[PDB]
Amino acid sequence: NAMKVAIVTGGTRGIGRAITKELYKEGYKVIAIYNSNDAKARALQEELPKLDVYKCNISDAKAVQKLVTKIFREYGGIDCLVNNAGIVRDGFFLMMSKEKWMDVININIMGLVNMSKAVLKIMKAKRIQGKVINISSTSGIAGQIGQANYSATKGAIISITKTLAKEFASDGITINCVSPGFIETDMTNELQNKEELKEHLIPLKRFGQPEEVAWLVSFLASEKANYITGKNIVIDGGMIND
Template sequence: MKVAIVTGGTRGIGKSITEELYNEGYQVIAVYNSNDAKALELTQQLPGLDVCKCDISDSKAVQRMVSKIYRTYGRIDCLVNNAGIIRDGYFLMMSEEKWMDVVNINLMGLVNMSKAVLKIMKAKHIHGKIINISSTSGVAGQVGQANYSATKGAIVAVTKTLAKEFAQDQININCVSPGFIETDMTSELRNKEEIKEHVIPLKRFGRPEEVGWLVAFLASDKANYITGKNIVIDGGMIND
């Protein structure tokens, strides 16, 4: 059985990715940071699912967790770097704290997880898959999200670089950039209907499972010749 780690894997888009990989037969380890209730609920929904509580901005904690996962299951075939936070604000009013909170989770969390997993994949000759979740904000920018957009743009660049560095090891590294997806985060938008009507050509928000389907494809053997790509899934909203 293949083993997959999904960060931020117990809610929102991450939950749908966890569910899709689980349904595809993976042993999934869903990593979360704070919401124990959501994690417990998901383990009850998906028998055999493993969950790990970890602050992915802490490189030592990440190393301990990934080492434990490898000792437990004997392999790591797939990593989905999905965890991310938003601390919005206009650029001139954005505090250093807001910048660093987003950088530490969105970017350095991905760096910490990728480094720990890639060391194992390379050393054990595992032809693995890494899928990084970026955003259309990282491709086209977004007012009030200079920090978030910066980290998501960096994720695209890191993806392309690591794909080249690890191609010789037959490790595929790709990126998925969702647009507006129906999650708790977008449910609070006051202008949802206006966005659907005037911004998105398909006239609707995406469903979390649609992102999950794309990630599962990239994790599969059907995507063995795809690496270093950023795939936008946004209903036709931006020209990428």
């Protein structure tokens, strides 16, 4: 029972679902935010009855500010924000439309901005020695064919992590980033080249599990990581050189 409040965007499926389950297990009050799938959210809240869930498009800043203000009033503060929501719109760069660029930009970048602005304003005004953990990707670090738009936003996320870490370090807020490689989710379940990935590209020869990303995020949110800030930790079975 940590007596702490955490927001996990994209917190009902995939990596976000595992992060939610891990912080819940550690005794956080968790608020999980999602975009469309009411069924997954309700099913997750039936499994974890103390969880709050909200359908909220994080690219809509006015709805984000309203939701963060609501959460702040019910639980007296915000101790941890995990910016995990994200989308992909793959395609070769020469066939990738403006719309695929702006859709991914508006969620992976502007959604992190909306949540982080609203939450950090509260942490600063109340002098909460809080935590922000962003989820990026090896794609943003090393590049990935067919992912110019995704990789761009994930590189932006790492840079925002470092800038904000410097801006809020004097307020005792740490701001870090976690960059997974290939994780067994649905975002990677439609791949057919999984065997070539494991056999040739990943030294540990397997995909990561959602729970393994959650364990790292939970370490960074805990009081055992207060001297770590501005860092990008890569969880990828050894796949890339950071």
